[PDB]
Design an enzyme around this catalytic site. Structure first.
Site, PDB file in Angstrom:
ATOM      1  N   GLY A   1    -122.043 -23.634  32.601  1.00 21.12           N
ATOM      2  CA  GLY A   1    -122.835 -22.632  31.900  1.00 21.12           C
ATOM      3  C   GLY A   1    -122.895 -21.414  32.804  1.00 21.12           C
TER       4      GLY A   1
ATOM      5  N   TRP B   1    -126.491 -16.885  39.087  1.00 23.34           N
ATOM      6  CA  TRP B   1    -126.794 -16.715  37.674  1.00 23.34           C
ATOM      7  C   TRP B   1    -127.400 -15.334  37.425  1.00 23.34           C
ATOM      8  CZ3 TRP B   1    -128.256 -21.504  39.937  1.00 23.34           C
ATOM      9  CH2 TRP B   1    -127.511 -22.613  39.494  1.00 23.34           C
TER      10      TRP B   1
ATOM     11  N   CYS C   1    -130.206 -17.882  33.266  1.00 23.09           N
ATOM     12  CA  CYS C   1    -129.363 -18.901  33.861  1.00 23.09           C
ATOM     13  C   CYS C   1    -128.088 -19.084  33.050  1.00 23.09           C
ATOM     14  CB  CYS C   1    -130.108 -20.234  34.007  1.00 23.09           C
ATOM     15  SG  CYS C   1    -129.173 -21.465  34.995  1.00 23.09           S
ATOM     16  N   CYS C   2    -128.007 -20.164  32.278  1.00 19.89           N
ATOM     17  CA  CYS C   2    -126.791 -20.457  31.522  1.00 19.89           C
ATOM     18  C   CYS C   2    -126.850 -20.265  30.023  1.00 19.89           C
ATOM     19  CB  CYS C   2    -126.366 -21.914  31.747  1.00 19.89           C
ATOM     20  SG  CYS C   2    -125.979 -22.386  33.444  1.00 19.89           S
TER      21      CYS C   2
END
Ligand SMILES: CC(C)(COP(=O)(O)OP(=O)(O)OC[C@H]1O[C@@H](n2cnc3c(N)ncnc32)[C@H](O)[C@@H]1OP(=O)(O)O)[C@@H](O)C(=O)NCCC(=O)NCCS
Ligand SMILES: CC(C)(COP(=O)(O)OP(=O)(O)OC[C@H]1O[C@@H](n2cnc3c(N)ncnc32)[C@H](O)[C@@H]1OP(=O)(O)O)[C@@H](O)C(=O)NCCC(=O)NCCS
Ligand SMILES: OC[C@H](O)[C@@H](O)CO
Ligand SMILES: OC[C@H](O)[C@@H](O)CO
Ligand SMILES: OC[C@H](O)[C@@H](O)CO
Ligand SMILES: OC[C@H](O)[C@@H](O)CO
Ligand SMILES: [Mg+2]
Ligand SMILES: [Mg+2]
Ligand code: NA
Ligand code: NA
Ligand code: NA
Ligand code: NA
Ligand code: NA
Ligand code: NA
Ligand code: NA
Ligand code: NA
Ligand code: NA
Ligand code: NA
Ligand code: NA
Ligand code: NA
Ligand code: NA
Ligand code: NA
Lengths: 759, 759
Positions: A734, A333, A418-419
């Site tokens: 994601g 990520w 992250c997402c």
């Protein structure tokens, strides 16, 4: 109060403002970037050096994928910012340098987070841990993991074991922190260190006056650690032959300096998500200046971007097999937020926005960095179409709603961690909380708190629901009761986790690149939303009959009649999903949190959809025991059957207002459903996203969209002949993964998801 | 809720009560000890084993004294409860076993407190530190010392450098903690571990409910660490061939078990004072039972006591030369509180009270353990006289006011930590604060905050007092101003120190032997009380003329006329001293403290009287620059010239009410002044102490008294011929030292103090 010679040379030609007198990266960007409304026609291709370098690295990637294990890892060195010597792929060819350890893809040991996890990885990958490392981190330096387990409650342990609250950050770095790495390039390390000493000194009065005594002492020590980390960053860069005491003076240095800031982070911390930030447009300021000066050519500019991005494709962390099940595909990520619009109406898209996307052509498809387009209906059409084209060709991008988030923050310098979790860069962070099993919580409501698989009392002892036909009002009232309990256990676990992570693995190098006071949210995630919503829908609109065992435990269900399922734009069930989101948000909102971190929620699962699904029995919606939940906020596998517009509409209804940590949706559409030819597909994809993200006073719009443009038949071919698709990348929750990096079970989850066949 | 077989056998014959159902050592003592009103005639002498053992150890002591350095110390092992193998003097002869390291008097490395101090000791004693130890405690495990220096303020550093606030616990263990080691003997380790798990569990509700969240998490982790330490204690004892899972079953085991509890403390922590507690009478319960059963003889009982006490004479810690100046004579303060009276009027004196004192005969005079008589006018005359006799023969005892402290606490199970600081055993501890320079603070008032030696602005910038003659009211008003500043800087420094000591060197093994909730006081000490009082007296009753340099700084003073000096029962000056004590107490009382530790004060200096004296210039009382202050609350050297009653009276006037951490007085009287012969001296000494400690509603009484009965001529002989006095012990500040263990400068301080020549 007096810029030295170093700043002068580096900032020549830049428009002046507050950014020169205080750390203020946004102000610098606003006064200096060049909006770009043109198309991709100016883009250069890869240089021979870039191809030689990446082709070599891909051999290590292939090895990782076929063995489903690290290429190599340390067994006797505790990683720190300065522990490792300089490492290279090929020093003669790299324009941007820096590796975590001394060799490409070799993973480090980051023991501050826990020693048992390292022992677990050594055993799993057949390597022997140095006894000294084990001794140091068992007897001398306590770890985050042991601090948490020393304070956990039997109740939290039962929830972890049963699969109602599992995979929380008690055995890996919490992550969800994005230091503003751009600060290193803009100011240089010395300037940032002087600024940190000033922040430290500003706390002296409160300390002496007894104002929030413990909080003041804690913060002063944290700032001292940040200052020390900045110093170590200089030593680290020096191993590579660079003096970063002063600000970057050109494009190559701005890119290199920014990367060094990030490199210190990934050498010292192993957070689940180690996101990059919102750097492409910032970096364009330096690239544009060098191009106009004739200092570099466009191909040289693309090459520097390629080498930076290549390094982001090489970030690795030693994880356990357990971690691999929760976060599949060897994710990092290293999220980069691209484009978006400024509060002043100008687009923040730059030529560099195009250069970052172009890495998917120069070096082919790749899951990392996690390139994220901040979408606005006002983005230049040229950019909207190029991004759509890149999605069609590579399925490597995700999109998020800038028309929703920029106004929510009233800020145009927020990035995605992250997402789908936004944060104003250098001013905000999240206390990661993974996610809770909402579907199992519903079963607990029906079964009086007794786990349907373990036959153990996990939730509070309650009267199991009686009768041959489930009644919605009764089930919902009990479910509301168990959501209260779930919220309290969840927040209690997170309170312990973040107290311990601050104590035993404080992210000094990342926090050193934030303001003195950082806003913190306590990010609580929910898994199984569509399973829970569809279960309530079946109970409410159909006749669901519990199948009980000799103990009265409901271990299966029989459904008579059809019922509306989430993802088909049917308000009867979509309203239930919206309600569940609102309901849980209100419950966590009432609880006290560590450091008064503001509770937020995300409908996000990563691979917990598979893990929780494996630990959850048969549910009222008809899902079979052991089956995966949908990823994030997705409708359950194959249940959204009315086309793209219908499913996009159901998801857009979920309230970001009550899920500020993000709402993840993975959309996969077959090429011919998207359009008859290339040009039409680009137009149609851009059109679908404009509609999904459409925002006005009365319409929130969707928050996030993963876009895969592929035929299921192609994935089946890849499952059978992986050697044929070494760089095949797919969006899964994601973030993206190389299809070959997944286990067979995880591939089965992916291939059985919905492949949209129509608008 | 069901005593197992282990408890049954061990507790056979003991009177039942609460102590069998909950940890309650006081209840056990009250229901089982045997008051002893007889004399010393029953005492046995040393066994051959005891003499063989001690004579051997004394050779190591002689070596320490002549080299003024450790016999040996570790350079590559980080000490913990279980780090070292069993060590012996002579395994075939010892009845009570256990050493800190593997060899007698070999000192350990206790790095959690700081690495720079260890480096300093290695350099000072010509030994090379293992690089691995340095690396671990610089990069992996942060130390207390570095945590403190990372958070200190420039102001506190200036105060440390200038000698106004120096020697605080930022570079050595804070100590002032007495775990109830008796608990190990009474209950056994397993019982205590189960009790700690219950305490841990009792905090779960508050944790889940968000009640004092951070405090609850902190305490739960501390209890987990305590529980782990108890387990390690069992492993430690097992190395010596003992299973201490269950309670001690006889006298030898009760003594051994109690000592093992203490041994774990001194293997894991290096607190300045590591006091033993109030154990002699507790241990008598077991000795008495074995004697009556004919299991052991009186000589065997004395032998066990001798071997325990011998081990207490062997506790050692690696200290730096800097520490040696602040705490001279290689002190340990293994303080043992003897006798006293119970709340019910019975005396708590036992035959074992006599056995502990007898060690000064069986093994000769020794500064450790620091045997402390809890004096009451109601003590049995036989005991009063024997203690007086022991003081006359050895000058190794100190006395404290039980008639004052027992009623203050309404408790008869309190013990003395270090020198004069009381705490209810297992329920209270002190956050050690060393002491502040009150004399230099007065000079700062006269000099506008500018240091008289460094000519640097240390205190807040203020107008220096003008004129050729100092005026008391003006000086006192400025002094009151600087005492406010001193109090704030002092408490701020201590707040940082104890936050960091709790974080980086939490005394788990000692705290494991305390109740769940421990009362904490923030103990602030004051040095130079008599110098300050006498300075004010000279200014008030005589004509003091400042001698200023070219900058207006008062660097000397000329006094015209006589003035009353503290220690001669003259209220004109004694009232000034009482006022200073009250004044500072009220100022620290207003400030916020870490963990809400209750501020207390002690008039105690240890060797800071020499250190602060060296850093303090000429004062208004006539004391010359560089000269030592008096020890503790003592009148300045040779100024108390009206006899014993007069000086004892001046000191008794100091209010314990405003100095709850203790008031230290070192009284030295020549033999012939005390009495014409042995019997008369005993009677007269007991009489002097009864008068000094006399307490009634309107008379507080003195709190503490060190008693030396010697001729100055003898000390001079010892200074010239140390080999002639290997065990010569003398009381010096609230503890004792072997005269030969002092540096020449420290001996000069001692020999120039007051040797009382009359009543
Ligand atoms: C190194 C530091 C202590 C200042 O050093 P300095 O200018 O030499 O300070 P001083 O002159 O007051 O000397 C420090 C004294 O403490 C002693 N010391 C003990 N432990 C120490 C430690 N861990 N670090 C530094 N000095 C230490 C030094 O040896 C010296 O003793 P001395 O006066 O007998 O020689 C620095 O850490 C500091 O200013 N700390 C305050 C907090 C701070 O600035 N934190 C970082 C904020 S970004
Ligand atoms: C060891 C301990 C965790 C309980 O162990 P247990 O009875 O085996 O617990 P569980 O059955 O719930 O298993 C613990 C799980 O956490 C995992 N784990 C991760 N880090 C761990 C750590 N540091 N210690 C122990 N287990 C750890 C275990 O491997 C296991 O995973 P699994 O269910 O996939 O096998 C114990 O420390 C405990 O009860 N702690 C709670 C707090 C406490 O009692 N503190 C001491 C108070 S005096
Ligand atoms: O250590 C590598 C992981 O085991 C693999 O799942 C990554 O795809
Ligand atoms: O062994 C006791 C230590 O404090 C351990 O818990 C952390 O290192
Ligand atoms: O290390 C021993 C000390 O230096 C000495 O002063 C003890 O008397
Ligand atoms: O070990 C403590 C140090 O300060 C570390 O956190 C940075 O090097
Ligand atoms: Mg377990
Ligand atoms: Mg210094
Ligand atoms: Na390849
Ligand atoms: Na690091
Ligand atoms: Na705090
Ligand atoms: Na670190
Ligand atoms: Na809230
Ligand atoms: Na929405
Ligand atoms: Na459309
Ligand atoms: Na001797
Ligand atoms: Na220990
Ligand atoms: Na706390
Ligand atoms: Na310890
Ligand atoms: Na107070
Ligand atoms: Na008094
Ligand atoms: Na008398």
């Amino acid at each position: 109060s007096e810029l030295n010679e170093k700043l002068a040379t580096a900032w020549e030609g830049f428009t002046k403002g507050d950014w020169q007198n205080e750390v203020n990266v946004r102000d610098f960007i606003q006064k200096n970037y060049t909006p770009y409304e043109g198309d991709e026609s100016f883009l250069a291709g890869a240089t021979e050096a870039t191809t030689t370098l990446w082709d070599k690295v891909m051999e290590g990637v292939k090895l990782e994928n076929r063995t489903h294990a690290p290429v190599d890892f340390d067994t006797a060195v505790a990683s720190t910012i300065t522990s490792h010597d300089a490492g290279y792929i090929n020093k003669q060819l790299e324009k941007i340098v820096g590796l975590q350890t001394e060799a490409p893809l070799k993973r480090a040991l980051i023991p501050f987070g826990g020693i048992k996890m390292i022992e677990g990885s050594c055993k799993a990958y057949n390597r022997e841990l140095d006894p000294m490392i084990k001794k140091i981190f068992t007897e001398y330096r306590k770890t985050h993991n042991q601090g948490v387990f020393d304070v956990y409650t039997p109740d939290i342990l039962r929830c972890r074991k049963s699969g109602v609250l599992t995979g929380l950050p008690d055995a890996y770095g919490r992550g969800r922190i994005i230091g503003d790495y751009r600060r290193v390039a803009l100011y240089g390390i010395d300037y940032l260190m002087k600024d940190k000493l000033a922040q430290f000194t500003s706390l002296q009065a409160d300390l002496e006056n007894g104002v929030n005594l413990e909080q003041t002492i804690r913060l002063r020590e944290e700032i001292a650690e940040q200052h020390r980390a900045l110093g170590q960053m200089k030593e680290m860069a020096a191993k590579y032959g660079y003096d970063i005491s002063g600000p970057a003076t050109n494009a190559q240095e701005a890119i290199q300096w920014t990367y060094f800031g990030y490199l210190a982070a990934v050498k010292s911390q192993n957070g689940a998500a180690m996101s990059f930030g919102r750097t492409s447009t910032f970096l364009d300021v330096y690239i544009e200046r060098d191009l106009k000066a004739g200092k570099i050519t466009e191909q040289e500019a693309q090459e520097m971007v390629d080498h930076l991005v290549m390094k982001l494709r090489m970030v690795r962390f030693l994880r356990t097999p357990e971690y691999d099940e929760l976060f599949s595909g060897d994710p990092i990520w290293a999220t980069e937020s691209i484009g978006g619009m400024g509060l002043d109406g100008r687009t923040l898209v730059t030529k560099n926005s195009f250069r970052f996307l172009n890495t998917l052509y120069t070096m082919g498809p790749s899951p990392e960095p996690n390139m994220t387009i901040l979408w606005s209906e006002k983005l230049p059409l040229n950019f909207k179409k190029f991004a759509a084209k890149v999605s069609i060709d590579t399925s490597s991008l995700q999109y998020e709603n800038d028309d929703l988030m920029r106004p929510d923050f009233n800020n145009d310098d927020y990035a995605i961690a992250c997402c789908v979790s936004p944060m104003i860069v250098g001013k905000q962070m999240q206390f990661f909380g993974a996610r809770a099993n909402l579907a199992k919580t519903m079963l607990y409501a029906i079964n009086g708190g007794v786990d349907e698989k373990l036959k153990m009392q996990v939730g509070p002892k309650s009267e199991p629901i009686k009768g041959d036909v489930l009644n919605y009002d009764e089930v919902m009232e009990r479910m509301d009761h168990f959501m209260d309990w779930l919220a309290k256990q969840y927040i209690t676990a997170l309170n312990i986790i973040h107290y311990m992570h601050d104590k035993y693995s404080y992210e000094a190098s990342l926090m050193a690149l934030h303001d003195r006071d950082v806003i913190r949210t306590m990010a609580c995630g929910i898994a199984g939303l569509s399973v829970a919503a569809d279960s309530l829908s079946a109970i409410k609109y159909a006749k669901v009959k519990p199948i009980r065992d000799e103990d009265g435990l409901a271990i299966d269900f029989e459904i008579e009649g059809e019922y509306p399922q989430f993802g088909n734009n049917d308000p009867r069930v979509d309203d239930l999903a919206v309600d569940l989101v609102e309901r849980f948000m209100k419950k966590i909102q009432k609880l006290h949190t560590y450091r008064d971190a503001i509770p937020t929620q995300s409908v996000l699962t990563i691979t917990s959809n598979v893990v929780y699904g494996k630990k959850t029995g048969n549910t009222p919606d008809g899902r079979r025991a052991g089956a995966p939940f949908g990823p994030g906020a997705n409708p359950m596998h194959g249940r959204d059957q009315k086309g793209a517009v219908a499913s996009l509409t159901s998801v857009a209804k979920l309230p970001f207002a009550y899920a500020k940590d993000g709402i993840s949706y993975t959309f996969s559409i077959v090429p011919n459903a998207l359009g008859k030819d290339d040009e039409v597909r680009k137009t149609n994809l851009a059109g679908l996203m404009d509609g999904y993200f459409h925002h006005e006073a009365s319409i929130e719009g969707g928050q996030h969209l993963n876009v895969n443009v592929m035929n299921r038949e192609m994935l089946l071919d890849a499952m059978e002949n992986p050697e044929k698709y070494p760089q095949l990348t797919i969006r899964v929750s994601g973030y993206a993964v190389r299809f070959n990096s997944l286990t067979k079970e995880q591939q089965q989850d992916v291939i059985t998801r919905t492949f949209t066949q129509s608008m």
